[PDB]
Design a protein around this ligand. Sequence first.
Ligand SMILES: N[C@@H](Cc1c[nH]c2ccccc12)C(=O)O
Ligand SMILES: N[C@@H](Cc1c[nH]c2ccccc12)C(=O)O
Ligand SMILES: N[C@@H](Cc1c[nH]c2ccccc12)C(=O)O
Ligand SMILES: N[C@@H](Cc1c[nH]c2ccccc12)C(=O)O
Ligand SMILES: N[C@@H](Cc1c[nH]c2ccccc12)C(=O)O
Ligand SMILES: N[C@@H](Cc1c[nH]c2ccccc12)C(=O)O
Ligand SMILES: N[C@@H](Cc1c[nH]c2ccccc12)C(=O)O
Ligand SMILES: N[C@@H](Cc1c[nH]c2ccccc12)C(=O)O
Ligand SMILES: N[C@@H](Cc1c[nH]c2ccccc12)C(=O)O
Ligand SMILES: N[C@@H](Cc1c[nH]c2ccccc12)C(=O)O
Ligand SMILES: N[C@@H](Cc1c[nH]c2ccccc12)C(=O)O
Lengths: 68, 69, 68, 68, 68, 67, 69, 68, 69, 69, 68
Amino acid sequence: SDFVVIKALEDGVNVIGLTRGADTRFHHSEKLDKGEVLIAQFTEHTSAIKVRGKAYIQTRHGVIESEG
Amino acid sequence: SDFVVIKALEDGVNVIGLTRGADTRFHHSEKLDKGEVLIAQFTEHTSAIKVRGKAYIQTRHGVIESEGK
Amino acid sequence: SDFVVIKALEDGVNVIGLTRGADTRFHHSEKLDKGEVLIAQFTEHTSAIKVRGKAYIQTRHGVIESEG
Amino acid sequence: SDFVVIKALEDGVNVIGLTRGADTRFHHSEKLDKGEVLIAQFTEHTSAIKVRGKAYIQTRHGVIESEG
Amino acid sequence: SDFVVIKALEDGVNVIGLTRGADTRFHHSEKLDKGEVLIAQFTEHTSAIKVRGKAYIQTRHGVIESEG
Amino acid sequence: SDFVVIKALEDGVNVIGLTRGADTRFHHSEKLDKGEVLIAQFTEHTSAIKVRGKAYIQTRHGVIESE
Amino acid sequence: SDFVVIKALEDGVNVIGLTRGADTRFHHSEKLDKGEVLIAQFTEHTSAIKVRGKAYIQTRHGVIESEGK
Amino acid sequence: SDFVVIKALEDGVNVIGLTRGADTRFHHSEKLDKGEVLIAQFTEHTSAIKVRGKAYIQTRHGVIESEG
Amino acid sequence: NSDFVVIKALEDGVNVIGLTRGADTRFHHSEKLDKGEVLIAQFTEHTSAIKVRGKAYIQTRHGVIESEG
Amino acid sequence: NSDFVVIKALEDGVNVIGLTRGADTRFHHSEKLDKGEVLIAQFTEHTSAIKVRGKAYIQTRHGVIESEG
Amino acid sequence: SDFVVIKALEDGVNVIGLTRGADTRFHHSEKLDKGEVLIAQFTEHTSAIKVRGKAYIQTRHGVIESEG
Ligand SMILES: N[C@@H](Cc1c[nH]c2ccccc12)C(=O)O
Ligand SMILES: N[C@@H](Cc1c[nH]c2ccccc12)C(=O)O
Ligand SMILES: N[C@@H](Cc1c[nH]c2ccccc12)C(=O)O
Ligand SMILES: N[C@@H](Cc1c[nH]c2ccccc12)C(=O)O
Ligand SMILES: N[C@@H](Cc1c[nH]c2ccccc12)C(=O)O
Ligand SMILES: N[C@@H](Cc1c[nH]c2ccccc12)C(=O)O
Ligand SMILES: N[C@@H](Cc1c[nH]c2ccccc12)C(=O)O
Ligand SMILES: N[C@@H](Cc1c[nH]c2ccccc12)C(=O)O
Ligand SMILES: N[C@@H](Cc1c[nH]c2ccccc12)C(=O)O
Ligand SMILES: N[C@@H](Cc1c[nH]c2ccccc12)C(=O)O
Ligand SMILES: N[C@@H](Cc1c[nH]c2ccccc12)C(=O)O
């Protein structure tokens, strides 16, 4: 099952898990300080992940960068 | 299951999930502001995804760019 | 399950689902205006997809372009 | 399942599905006008596909061109 | 399931399905005229295919040409 | 399931199927004349394939030629 | 199932497992001192992993580095 | 299941199937005359294959030749 | 059919520590390696994370990495 | 569907030995190859390790290796 | 299921199978003399393998050498 890597490029990056299912809203927000890395899967409860704030992101389709 | 990456290139971008099944309609519109990235799967409930607004998009088939009205 | 990416290159492009099953008829026509992108799977309900109007198309077999 | 991409290079191209099963006959003929694109799977009902008319075709095996 | 692509390079090319099972015989022969393409799967009923007549053939193993 | 492509390079080529199972014998021989192509899977009934006569063969492991 | 490799580049690096399921919380924090290596899977109990502290990280998407505190 | 291609480079080559199971013995020898090709799978009944005589052999791991 | 890691000890007394799979996380075994020995160790029903202490050359599916003592 | 090894005897009296699968490990069969004969042998429900003695050219999915008598 | 290739570079190389399960101990040691090769799988009974002595080793992750 797929995962994304998120490296925070500043304090307070917000990695937001959206609920899997007929309804969509966020069910968890994990904040990262600058330099921290989160490696997070798609799961039974999370089917979309949003990143807010400056982050360096890797997925199976390559590198992408969120800007705050 | 496959996923698409969408990075908003201006405020107010909408990533719209279309319902899976005989019926086709919008069930959710996720609004993205400039700089934010959404990584969204295809799912039991979403079998097509529409992007309105300027965005940089990656899928397994490569990069594509939506342009806003 | 695979999908196809369609970017509309002018207004009023139609992405048409054809029904899976013994019967083949339309079922849904999604209208894309210029610059809009639709990323659409093959599904239990849709086993063929037609594009009408000018669009840039990506599939697992590469790029192709429809013309209006 | 595998799918084929067909781009009509002239009007009145026919993409014809042959029935899966002990019997082989045409169950459906999809007419494409010049410039239209049909992306069509193999399915429970369709185990062979015939293209009549000038078209550009992609399959997992690469490009091939049908001629009028 | 695998498929073979056949482009007829002359009229009257025959793409012949051989029966799956203990018995081997021809259950169907599809006639292609010049420039027609047939894309044909292996199936529950067809476990070998024979092409007779001049054609350009693609499979997973590459290109081969039959001659009349 | 995998397949073999055989192109006959002369008349009279035989593509022979061998029975799956505890016992091994020929259950079918398909005759190919010059230029005809057969594409043949391994199956419930055929676990080995013999080619006799001159033909160009392709498999997943590349090209080989019978004489 | 996928794994990540983490090599601590200073003392006191934490490799933190987040719970799988509807509830998300830390359920374990593995402390690495400098030069130690942990190779950790995703599991029925861990669906996300956070690294805090200076570390060299390998995943199937390649090399990433966490930067300390 | 994997298969092996054996092309006999002299008469009398033997392709020998060894029994699957706790017992190991030869259950069949297929004799190949010069220039014959045999394409043979691993099966419920055959878990090792021995070749005797001069032959050009292909497997998933590349070419090897046997010599008489 | 799980993944495995290759650990070659570059000095005596390297420890390859298996961590328990499941809700709880603890060391269930430390295999001690002397210099020049190679351990090839899978992830398993009982081991979902592996810690290496001491100097070792390591190979996994994501490449080479080295632990330091 | 299992993996297999190709063994080409480079001298007479080469032995390809099958070791039993399961809790008990012993030799259950030894196949004698004379010079230039080839054996293509799978791992099986009965054979979970294969030993080659004598001079032979061996191909696995990991590449070529050679045994020396 | 994965396997390791071990080529003894001196006499008395010991290939040691460790028990799968909650407990860890060795359940078999297979000694190799110089120039013998052992191709050993991971199995229902062996989930870790230790090599002692000078040996050339291939795994899916490449070559490694043990030193005795
Ligand atoms: N609840 C939605 C979340 C989602 C996933 N991908 C999407 C694409 C667009 C809009 C919403 C979504 C679902 O599981 O389908
Ligand atoms: N409800 C439709 C959504 C859809 C997916 N792919 C399409 C292609 C064309 C039109 C509609 C669709 C379905 O699941 O089939
Ligand atoms: N209803 C048809 C739709 C179809 C898919 N592929 C085709 C190719 C040709 C003609 C029709 C089709 C089916 O499910 O089989
Ligand atoms: N009814 C036939 C259609 C077919 C598929 N591949 C073919 C090849 C040759 C002739 C017929 C066919 C079948 O399902 O098998
Ligand atoms: N009825 C045969 C047809 C066949 C497939 N491949 C073959 C190779 C040789 C001879 C016959 C065949 C079968 O299903 O097995
Ligand atoms: N009846 C044998 C045929 C066979 C397959 N592969 C072989 C290799 C060698 C000799 C015989 C065979 C079987 O199914 O096993
Ligand atoms: N007992 C934990 C061990 C573990 C695996 N990967 C981890 C990542 C971080 C922290 C703990 C772990 C589990 O099976 O899930
Ligand atoms: N409990 C959450 C943990 C998680 C995984 N991926 C995430 C992405 C964003 C936020 C939370 C998560 C889950 O298993 O789904
Ligand atoms: N009995 C242990 C053996 C093992 C596998 N990999 C390990 C890594 C470290 C320590 C022990 C092991 C198990 O099956 O899990
Ligand atoms: N009867 C043995 C035959 C065998 C397969 N591979 C081997 C390797 C060595 C010795 C014997 C064999 C088995 O099925 O397991
Ligand atoms: N009977 C043992 C044989 C074995 C396979 N791989 C090994 C590695 C080392 C020692 C023994 C083995 C097993 O099935 O597990």
